[PDB]
From a paper:
To gain insight into its biological function, we determined the crystal structure of native αD-GeXXA using ab initio methods and refined it to 1.5 Å resolution. There is one conotoxin homodimer with a pseudo two-fold symmetry per asymmetric unit. Each peptide chain consists of an N-terminal domain (NTD, residues 1–20) and a C-terminal domain (CTD, residues 21–50). The NTD comprises an N-terminal loop and a β-strand, and the CTD assumes several extended loop conformations. The dimerization involves mainly the N-terminal loops and β-strands of the NTDs, which is further stabilized by two inter-chain disulfide bonds between Cys6 of one chain and Cys18 of the other. There are three disulfide bonds (Cys24-Cys36, Cys29-Cys46 and Cys34-Cys48) in the CTD, making the CTD adopt a compact structure. The two CTDs flank the dimeric NTDs, and the relative conformation of the NTD and the CTD is stabilized by a disulfide bond between Cys19 and Cys28. Interestingly, the CTD of αD-GeXXA adopts a canonical inhibitory cystine knot (ICK) disulfide linkage, as observed in many 6-Cys-residue-containing bioactive peptides, including several families of conotoxins. On the other hand, the length of αD-GeXXA (up to 52.4 Å between the Cα atoms of the two C-terminal Met50 residues) makes it unlikely that αD-GeXXA binds in the nAChR central pore or on the outside-facing surface of the pentameric extracellular domains. However, the pseudo two-fold symmetry and the length of the dimeric full-length αD-GeXXA suggest that the two CTDs of this toxin most likely bind the two “α9α10” interfaces at the top surface of α9α10 nAChR.
Here we present the crystal structure and electrophysiological activity profile of a dimeric αD-conotoxin GeXXA. N-terminal sequencing and subsequent cDNA cloning of this toxin revealed that each peptide chain of αD-GeXXA comprises 50 amino acid residues sharing high sequence homology with other known αD-conotoxins. Our electrophysiology data showed that αD-GeXXA has strong inhibitory activity on α9α10, α7 and α3β2 subtypes, moderate inhibitory activity on α3β4 and α1β1δε subtypes, and weak activity on α4β2 and α4β4 subtypes. In summary, by resolving the crystal structure and performing structure-guided dissection of a dimeric conotoxin αD-GeXXA, we demonstrate that αD-conotoxins inhibit nAChR most likely by binding of the two CTDs cooperatively to two inter-subunit interfaces on the top surface of nAChR.
Residue numbers in the entry:
A (entry chain B): 3 to 39, 42 to 50
B (entry chain A): 2 to 50
The structure:
């Protein structure tokens, strides 16, 4: 349902972004989409 | 991997996810564990030690 990323080698719990993941960036809110080019980032409702 | 993403606390955009296998609430030691039901103790994992 979302990418699950490893935290430490060995740990069974990873981390995941609850809102929107834009490359490596987890957006502040769910109502954000991704922009890429500045730099990659989140575009969110004003 | 791709997994269900559980919230840890309000306001936080990063949640947690079980990289192995989830047996209801329990994240198992290994991806190859399977889920059991223990009478009086509930859902759990059974794993190759």
């Amino acid at each position: 349902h979302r990418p699950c990323q490893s935290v430490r080698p060995g740990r069974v719990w990873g981390k995941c972004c609850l809102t929107r993941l834009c490359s490596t960036m987890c957006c502040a809110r769910a109502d954000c989409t991704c922009v890429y080019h500045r730099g990659h980032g989140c575009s969110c409702v004003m």
